[PDB]
Every structure is written in C-alpha cells, then in structure tokens.
C-alpha cells in the first residue's frame, strides 16, 4: 500500500530538522581549536561539543520530543548523544579513504587522529567497521534521519520516567520507517532488520566509549581540555 | 648599601620563573579558538585559561609558595589570578596602539575586541588606563616580576588560613623590591610607592571583573564558551 499523510509529515519534519542542524559545508569547523598531529583532544572535544548542540536542535524538531518532560529530554539526550553523533558522522565518512572527510586535509580524521585524543583500537576498530557497514547499506536520507530519531527516542535508557510515552513515539517512528522502506526502497526487504541491528551496534559502541571517556575525564590534565557541554552531557552528573 | 645574597637569589628565581612561564613569541596562540570580529568570548576565554596555567607555574617557582598548604595556594591563586593576568599582560600592551600586540593583527586586542567578549567600558576604561600608567612607569624586569609575586602572596585574600606566613613572605619580597629600586633604579625614589598603588588599582579592577564575569557566567549560553579551568578558578566554588 502507501504511507499516510501523518507519516509523510513526520518524514518531512525529520529531514528538515536534519538539514537545519547539519552543515555539509563543515565551515564552522574553522572555529574549533585547530587539530595538531593527546594532541587531537582539543579539536575533537570541540567537534563533539558542537555536534551535541546540533543533536539537541535536531531532537528539537522531532514531533513529540518537546512535549516530553524536560527531565525525560535530558535523560534521552545524555545516554543517546554519542550514538546520534556516531550515526550522523556517517554522512562525512567515506569508504574510499576509510575516514571522515569534512574540510580539507586538516579536517579529515583517520584512525590515528582519534588515537591521539585518548581512545584505543578497542573503540576505534568497531567504530570504523560500524561506519563501513552502515555506509554500505546506502540509506536514503529519510531512513538515515528516521534511524537517528528512533535511536534517540529509545525508552530503554537509564533515567527515563515516562517509558509508555517514549516507547509510543518510538513505535510510530519505527512503523513509518518500516513502511517507507517497503514502499519507496527497492530491495529493502531485509534492510529494516539490519538497521535495527545497527542500533544494537551503537549500544556496544556507546559502552566502550563511556568506559574510555571515564578514564580520560578522571585525569584533570585531560578533562581540562574538554568543554562544559561535553562534561555536562557525558558526565554521570544525574 | 647593597642587596644581600638571599635577595639576589630571590630575584633570580623570580625572573627565571617569569621567563619559563611567558613566551614572547606568543606562538601557542594559534592553538586557541580563533578570534572573530559575543564573538571574541571563545578566543579570549582560551587566552585567559592558558594564562591561568602560566600563572600557576610562575607561582610554582616563587620561593616558599609551595611550602604553603595546598588550600592556601588555591585561595591565593583564585583571588589573585585575574590581577596577575592583568599585570603580566602589560608586557604585550603597547602605548603606540593602545592595545595588546601578541601576534599579527589577529592577536592584537583593542578595546572593541574585549567588548565583544561580554565586558563593558566600566571595566575596560580603568583597565586600559591601568596598562597605560603601569607601562609609563617603565619597570625593570626584576620589578615587574617582584610586583607579580607580591600581588599573589597577598594575605588579605578571602580563604587564606595562614596569614602570618603569607604576610611574612610578602614582606620579604617587598623589602627585596624596595631595596632593588633604591640601589639599582636611578630616580626610583617614589617608584615603589607608585607600584604599591598599582596593586590597589588591581583590587578595583578585580572587583568589577568579578562582577561582570558573574553576569556572564550565570548565562549558560555564555558560560558554555568558557573553559573548565576558567570556571573552576573564577567560580565561587570554594
């Protein structure tokens, strides 16, 4: 069959929200502290902090996210932030160079660059393999933003209070996605299942990042290089 | 008469400490977030945060500062930091341009630049007049570092516990300074009194900065642009 008017509206809301909160020019990157080849921590902390602001604004056009309590919104953002960032970064990832190409050579981040920001191959290896698998799925823009909104409105996050409601919005987004794939995506007959498994990958990426971030945020000579937003969001402040 | 061996040692310790913690090349400035013409807040926050690290290291070669309790050291640094920074910045201030010239044109800060970092002429006017008066005093390098060490080891700071001891080290530094002026500074017969009055100026500059910083640190869209070190040091965390 076809998609309802309500699902078309949700799709249009989501991609407009992604378009407003993601700059294909990457021109704001000149305002981060410049990269140096833990030499990359200042630049990459700025990059993530900037990305967190974007993710907050994207969240902010998700239909129904705002109508949740401010505590639920904070819970959802704090535990899903790094996953949305990992997800959205696939738009700059390129299989030809196996890295993220945002500007010229200064703003291209390969594995060795992230190494010099306090992270090991235990995170980098699954992360790059995640970007590779997700890029080969060749998602439509609608599926990409749908996946990000589904990932963020997960009710199985610590701290969420109104599970019922969040799971409800997450379910309606899953049905829009599942329907958009079966109608407008040729040969997507197993795609949705694979996307749902990408979410599970993000959970394992999340936990190893949360571990590695802890060890660096617990050393003041390193956590002094982070930003207030990063510390607030990635800290266990509760 | 002449200066004792002990006072020569103190002088040499102080200027070596200043030389190690102050870079006339200003070449680390490329690693701050770049200035933009509250557009200057990110660059100037980075500049101050970097300067705080330097001031800590300078403090760290002051003979006797380390032998104080770690709480006294924190008390002394938290309330004197912005004053030492105002003082040390006179080395880049130039009367010919009425601003601080550190790099090329990007790293020259005139009054309008600081305006766009959340500060009013109520602070900027006395600050620039302070830099002007202090630069026309044409201090020797020894007097400049002596003045900074005296300013930091002031026992009339909130939070200090061992007044006796800090006032003692402050007194010995004042007598070294007073003696160096009368022996090695031609026509300095009123200079020391004027330097002591510069300290009083710093107190009034300190308080108006503390007020203006409060109003900006209380707006999260602005305090998110500060650094962890700046927030820790300039906050009333106690």
């Amino acid at each position: 069959h076809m998609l309802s008017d309500e699902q078309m509206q949700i799709i249009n809301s989501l991609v407009e929200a992604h378009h407003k909160t993601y700059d294909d020019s990457y021109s704001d990157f000149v305002r981060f502290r410049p990269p140096v080849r833990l030499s990359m921590l200042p630049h990459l902390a700025d990059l993530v902090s900037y990305s967190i602001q974007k993710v907050i604004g994207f969240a902010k056009m998700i239909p129904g996210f705002r109508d949740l309590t401010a505590e639920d919104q904070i819970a959802l953002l704090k535990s899903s932030a790094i996953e949305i960032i990992m997800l959205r970064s696939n738009q700059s990832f390129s299989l030809e160079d196996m890295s993220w190409s945002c500007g010229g050579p200064d703003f291209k981040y390969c594995i060795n660059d992230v190494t010099k920001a306090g992270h090991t191959l235990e995170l980098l290896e699954p992360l790059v393999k995640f970007q590779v698998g997700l890029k080969k799925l060749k998602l439509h823009e609608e599926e990409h933003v749908l996946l990000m909104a589904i990932c963020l409105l997960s009710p199985d996050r610590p701290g969420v209070q109104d599970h019922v409601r969040i799971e409800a919005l997450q379910d309606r987004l899953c049905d829009v996605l599942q329907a958009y794939i079966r109608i407008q995506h040729p040969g997507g007959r197993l795609l949705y299942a694979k996307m749902i498994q990408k979410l599970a990958d993000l959970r394992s990426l999340n936990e190893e990042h949360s571990k590695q971030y802890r060890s660096l945020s617990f050393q003041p000579e390193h956590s002094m290089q982070l930003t207030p937003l990063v510390l607030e969001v990635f800290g266990s402040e509760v | 008469h002449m200066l004792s061996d002990e006072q020569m040692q103190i002088i040499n310790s102080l200027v070596e400490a200043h030389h190690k913690t102050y870079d006339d090349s200003y070449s680390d400035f490329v690693r701050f977030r770049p200035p933009v013409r509250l557009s200057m807040l990110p660059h100037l926050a980075d500049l101050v945060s970097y300067s705080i690290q330097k001031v800590i290291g300078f403090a760290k070669m002051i003979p006797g500062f380390r032998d104080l309790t770690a709480e006294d050291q924190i008390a002394l640094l938290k309330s004197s930091a912005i004053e030492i920074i105002m003082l040390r910045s006179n080395q880049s201030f130039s009367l010919e341009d009425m601003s601080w010239s550190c790099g090329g044109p990007d790293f020259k800060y005139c009054i309008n630049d600081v305006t766009k970092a959340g500060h009013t002429l109520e602070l900027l006017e006395p600050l620039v007049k302070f830099q002007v008066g202090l630069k026309k005093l044409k201090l020797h390098e020894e007097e400049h570092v002596l003045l900074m060490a005296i300013c930091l080891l002031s026992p009339d700071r909130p939070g200090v516990q061992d007044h006796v001891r800090i006032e003692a080290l402050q007194d010995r530094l004042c007598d070294v300074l007073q003696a160096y002026i009368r022996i090695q500074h031609p026509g300095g017969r009123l200079l020391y009194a004027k330097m002591i009055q510069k300290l009083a100026d710093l107190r009034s500059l300190n308080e108006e900065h503390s007020k203006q910083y409060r109003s900006l640190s209380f707006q999260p869209e602005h305090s998110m642009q500060l650094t962890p070190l700046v927030l820790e040091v300039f906050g009333s965390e106690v």
């Binding site: 604004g57 919104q73 704090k78 937003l229 607030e232 | 999260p220 305090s223």
Partner: peptide, 11 residues
C-alpha cells in the same frame, strides 16, 4: 543540574 542542557532546550 544540567544548566546548559536545560538552557539549550529552552527555547
């Protein structure tokens, strides 16, 4: 708690 997050979610 979460001074900046609150701020960025309002407006």
């Amino acid at each position: 708690r979460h001074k900046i997050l609150h701020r960025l979610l309002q407006e």
